[PDB]
A paper describes a structure:
Thus, the [name] is a key regulator of the composition of transmembrane proteins in the ciliary membrane, and is thought to be evolutionarily related to other transmembrane protein trafficking complexes including clathrin coats and the COPI and COPII coatomers. The recruitment of the [name] to ciliary membranes (where it binds transmembrane protein substrates) is mediated by a highly specific interaction with [name] (also known as BBS3). Here, we use single-particle cryo-EM to determine structures of the native bovine [name] complex with and without [name] at 3.5 Å and 3.1 Å resolution, respectively. The structures reveal the mechanism of [name]-mediated activation and provide new insights into the pathogenesis of BBS-causing mutations and the evolutionary relationship between the [name] and other transmembrane protein trafficking complexes.
However, our 3.5 Å resolution structure of the [name]:[name]:GTP complex shows that the head remains in a closed, downward conformation even in the presence of [name]. This swiveling action involves a rotation of approximately 25° and a movement of 13 Å away from BBS2βprop. The N-terminal half of BBS4 shows a small 2–3 Å displacement to accommodate the movement of BBS1βprop. The swiveling of BBS1βprop opens a central cavity in the [name] with dimensions of 50 × 15 Å, wide enough to accommodate a polypeptide chain. This cavity is flanked by the newly exposed edges of BBS1βprop, BBS2β-prop and BBS7βprop as well as BBS4 and BBS8 in the body. The first and last blades of BBS1βprop interact with the switch two loop and helices α3 (residues 75–78) and α4 (residues 98–108) of the GTP-bound [name]. Density for GTP and the ordered switch loops of [name] are clearly visible in our reconstruction. We also see an additional interaction between [name] and the loop that connects BBS7βprop with BBS7hx (residues 320–335).
Author numbering:
A (entry chain 1): 195 to 406, 424 to 479, 483 to 590
B (entry chain 0): 7 to 58
C (entry chain 4): 29 to 402, 408 to 424
D (entry chain 9): 642 to 828
E (entry chain 8): 64 to 81, 90 to 141, 158 to 499
F (entry chain 1): 1 to 66
The structure:
Amino acid sequence: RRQTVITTMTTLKKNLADEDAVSCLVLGTENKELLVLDPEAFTILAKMSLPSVPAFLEASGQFDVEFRLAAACRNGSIYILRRDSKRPKYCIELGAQPVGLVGVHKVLVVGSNQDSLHGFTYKGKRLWTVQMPAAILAMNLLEQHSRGLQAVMAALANEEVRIYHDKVLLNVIRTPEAVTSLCFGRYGREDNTLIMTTLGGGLIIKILKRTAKLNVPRKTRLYVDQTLREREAGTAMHRTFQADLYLLRLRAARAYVQALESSLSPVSREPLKLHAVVQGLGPTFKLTLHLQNTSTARPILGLVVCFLYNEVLYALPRAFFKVPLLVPGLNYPLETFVKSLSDKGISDIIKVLVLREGQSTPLLSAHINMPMSEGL
Amino acid sequence: MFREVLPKQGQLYVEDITTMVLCKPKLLPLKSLTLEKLEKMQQAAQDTIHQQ
Amino acid sequence: FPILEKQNWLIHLYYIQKDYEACKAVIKEQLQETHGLCEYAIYVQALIFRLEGNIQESLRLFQMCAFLSPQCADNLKQVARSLFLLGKHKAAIEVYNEAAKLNQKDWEICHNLGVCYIYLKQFDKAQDQLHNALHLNRHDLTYIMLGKIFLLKGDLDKAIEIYKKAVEFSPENTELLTTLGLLYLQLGIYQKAFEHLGNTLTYDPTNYKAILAAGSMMQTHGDFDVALTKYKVVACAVIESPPLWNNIGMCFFGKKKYVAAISCLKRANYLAPLDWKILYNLGLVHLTMQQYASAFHFLSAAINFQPKMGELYMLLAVALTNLEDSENAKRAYEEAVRLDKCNPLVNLNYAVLLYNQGEKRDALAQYQEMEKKVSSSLEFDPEMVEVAQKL
Amino acid sequence: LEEYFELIDHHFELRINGEKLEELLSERAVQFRAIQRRLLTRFKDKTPAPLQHLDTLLDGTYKQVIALADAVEENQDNLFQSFTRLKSATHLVILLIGLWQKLSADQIAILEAAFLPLQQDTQELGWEETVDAALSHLLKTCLSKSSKEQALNLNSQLGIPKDTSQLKKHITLFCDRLAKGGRLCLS
Amino acid sequence: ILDENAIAQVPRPGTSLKGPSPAVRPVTQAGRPITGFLRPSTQSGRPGTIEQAIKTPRTAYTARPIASSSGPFINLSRLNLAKYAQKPKLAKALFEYIFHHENDVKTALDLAALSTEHSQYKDWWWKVQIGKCYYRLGLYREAEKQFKSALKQQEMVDTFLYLAKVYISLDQPLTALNLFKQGLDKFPGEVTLLCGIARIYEEMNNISSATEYYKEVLKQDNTHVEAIACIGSNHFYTDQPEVALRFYRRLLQMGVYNCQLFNNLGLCCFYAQQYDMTLTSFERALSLAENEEEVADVWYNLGHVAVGTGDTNLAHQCFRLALVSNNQHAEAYNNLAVLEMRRGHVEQAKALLQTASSLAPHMYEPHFNFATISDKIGDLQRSYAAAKKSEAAFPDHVDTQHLIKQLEQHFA
Amino acid sequence: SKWLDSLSDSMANIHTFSACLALADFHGDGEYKLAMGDLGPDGRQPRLKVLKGHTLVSQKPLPDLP
């Protein structure tokens, strides 16, 4: 059979709500269900249907006439359960999974995974939100009836715990290590005991006393002399710079055309990109050609690589080989083993030509200055 | 004798938009004298090896 | 025969406190014991992977969680989300559709379909889907995406209503306030823009994206020292940002600190050599400084970066008039007057060039063109009347 | 498609064995380097001292390194033989696919480019990843119409897989979608 | 890597050898901005493992490609060094021959030991030579002993610089600085000592004192190529290109005629707004370049000039020529990809930025641009993997932080 | 300094949570104890431990994790 597991458990008051009243359990099954039990934990009083597995629970009021059940689930939402409603129908999303849930008499705080608290109303309308400096590990309730102080706590991950009322911070403490669980009650014989457990173990018990301009640069004589020369001889500068720009365009076009002629550009309709890396000292170097098809979606079927070296200095096993089908977007490393043959250190260039199989003009090329041999 | 009037107000950015940055101009570092001598002595051996 | 999900609560509590170390160990132990089929040691593990940079193993494990629970809308949502975190939006849409044919009452599917159709440039379907996402459950990000749709597709006339309705509720979001203020700047309104930018600055005093626009608005209506202080507020947070230094250089150019403005403008230009606004500002300041050789250079650069402008060619022609090149100034002024529509300064300056060339014939044509175009500048008023009476 | 997969699996088992042998050789080399640095430190020191059998650990590590090097050499030779036999098998398979359906010269050239990518294996690119990327792309741009599968299953990478099931699935799917009447293209 | 001599393993930050941000000054490693005046003693960072040092460019940690470790007139195996040691007039020149010509440190040390014992250990020169033999044999302390014993005999700038080398080899900057100030107490205005102090201060990367000591060198020499080049570079990159143009025109005035000097003069002239002497300097540079990497750098800088002028086509051609001349030029790839994405070709830009970030991982611009374009189209996984490497390259960036925040927000 | 510190210990391996740890009266006479279902040091050994004063009085094994 397919049973379930219980994850969250709190109590709910029957009719009196004093120190001697009878309380009834409320279980949150792993199956998305809430079981409102009996005073003696043997029979079911109610079965409530929830849309997601609850993680945190809050029970306010008296069960018979006025019960409010807030359920923080795993889907990052608070669902409230009232009388006659088998389904909540009043849900509030937090945007992040709720790490805690503590119910103040009027406001309901929800601790977010985004390191903050969000105070909502029991009708489904947020009224405030406060930001934490670090993560929220555990939220509990600090209630002292002498001063009527019922404030939510916060066990932050930055090695501190800050007690929070409606909006104000107070009584922030420090710990030698970030704290994972806090409890405030009448432990021992003090109405104001707070016991706290470190993320690494250990215990810290605290008893609350009842007596609570810019970098704008500078300019020197050189700058004013240069600006004076520019103001007195601006025309000649303009003319000679335009002449120099014309000559530069001329020479750049010349070199671009010469490169196109020799096809020496490792980057050059017909999309490709290749560059050759050399690795290793010693007589044997690993020469890996990183080749890449740079197109939207079009493979390149017939291509082939041919090496040009000095056959007296380098012994290439396979100086010519086909390349795989180049899929657009993947860098193919195609490696070879160059080997220096000269007994004396001689560094000679090696050319690489990538070309079609039906054409004789290289599609593109690359050069590599082979380093020294460091032989034997 | 009329002087052309220039606008007194420039163009001001009203939002910071992430633009691809370029690498920065590279001042070629100079060399020492020992380094030049070492490189020339390294290449002279190559030249004599090729010239034999 | 042991219970399947024995420790889902413990795994959830370890994952929700941002541990990702003990949670992983408990996940591995649970999976080794149960030989799989846990559906929540895989789910939380994939979410942890997604929290790290990896969005591939997250997709794989969400695929496994969908395979375990074939009818579970949240698993399909998570798989489509893992797709959308990669570049594939069509497949994300086609998985969100299946996630919707199992649950027709959630806002997340519609919001994510909107943001996907946005990346797919299908604006009708995106717009309708985001309207639906509002009607199911209004969220801030849906409002932002709808405003983005109405800005990309059309005009701010459609975005002002949406952003106003958005800021109407939950008015503490800095993004909404700041974007509505920016869109007010984009139009003639300068008052409500200041209102919303101040509303933002009350919450966040050091908001860089709002300080920049506030300082811009301030510079526009004089009072450069207030904008300079606004920029001093954020100078150290962003010490190298071209827009900030361009605005600071225009501040220093306002109060006749031309050298300390050339400095900031050149620094901003070095950090962004492809930004036409800094080039235009450098050209203008070098015109005001009467250098006329760098002014032409920077204005020609800004022309080569944004050529469909009228003031650029006007300033380039004013730089060419003092460079002993009057024919180039003629053709530049022709380009400008053809490419300018609502700035009479170009017409007045071309009239000045013509009248100084001894023509006095087409100078009247440029004067009449200016007077047809038209009104605040103190020194463009006098030359208006002096080139009138002397013609 | 079934006596063809066993050769692929033999090839991939040899590849995985080679990667394991190499990651073991890495550890052996690190041990040798550490013990060698210890011995060099003992050498540079003036004062005499017992070797503490550091030389024995060095000899043991050296024997391990030589054994692993010989193992890697033999695995490389076995991998090369398996690659040649796999090349012959895939030649036959492309032939039988180009006959089993009236495939022209263009589609036969596409198949020869996709299935016969390399001449031998290297520690950065192997037959499996390359043919898998090529087949995933050929099914992506030509033989698929659903975008969900196009993004979920029909993806291409150039890293050594942990299993050959994706490659075999893609090959069977290729033959299937050819049987229904599909045809290959490039654009 | 394989030689450990520093006593302290993790010493205080500021006492070990092992300014403008990478948004202004180009870089060579994660940090270590590019320097002026390459000298063959520059280490400029160090690798972590043998694999990283091998799988990187051969000239990324030294001015020259790294090695594995740092008829005939007279046959060394024929002469009895015990007889040439008796004659010091022969012994000194013979030792200089063996040491600097043949590079036989063991026989040189044998000769030097016999000579020193012949002189009854009373001449500092043989002590310095034995110390040098030791220092290049590997024994630093055994060399520091001889250098100290030679300083005791007679103070010389040579022995001071030798001890400085020894102390820097043992990773002890603050000992070398005290020794240098002691030497300056002996020689009140020596230029090599001040330059060594400045080199140590720049290796420790506190430029605010290296500039002071280079200024002292200038007050002494005023033709020093090292101090002039360093102060000039620092003046150029801290948005003062006119002072750098002056500092480099000084080297031009002193007969220096290089490819580096003229490209530097071109950069300075253009960025100091002197448009008449800008491009002729780049032309002289292209003329003087005795390499294929120098030509590529000059074409890269000409493309920078062009893109500062506008006319992105000329800069396109110049970057492509920088690639043609040096295939492993990552800045050219990055800038050409920026111009491509300016045109519209996104896939070309992606591939070129991937190539750039593969060639130089220590740079931050290719990673940032790849992450930016990815995030623009989607692919938040690639955007994260690239922005995180950007933050690894330039960890105090700003746009990288906003990108990482947006990404980590999309992941939840 | 409103929070008077009482005990700070670090050897107590108490890896409970903020919900499986509750204090109440357990033998009358106005002496409140604190019962907690503590996991293992890692989460392997479920052990119910109760605390009176600041010395451990009874820890006993539990079938499964509370």
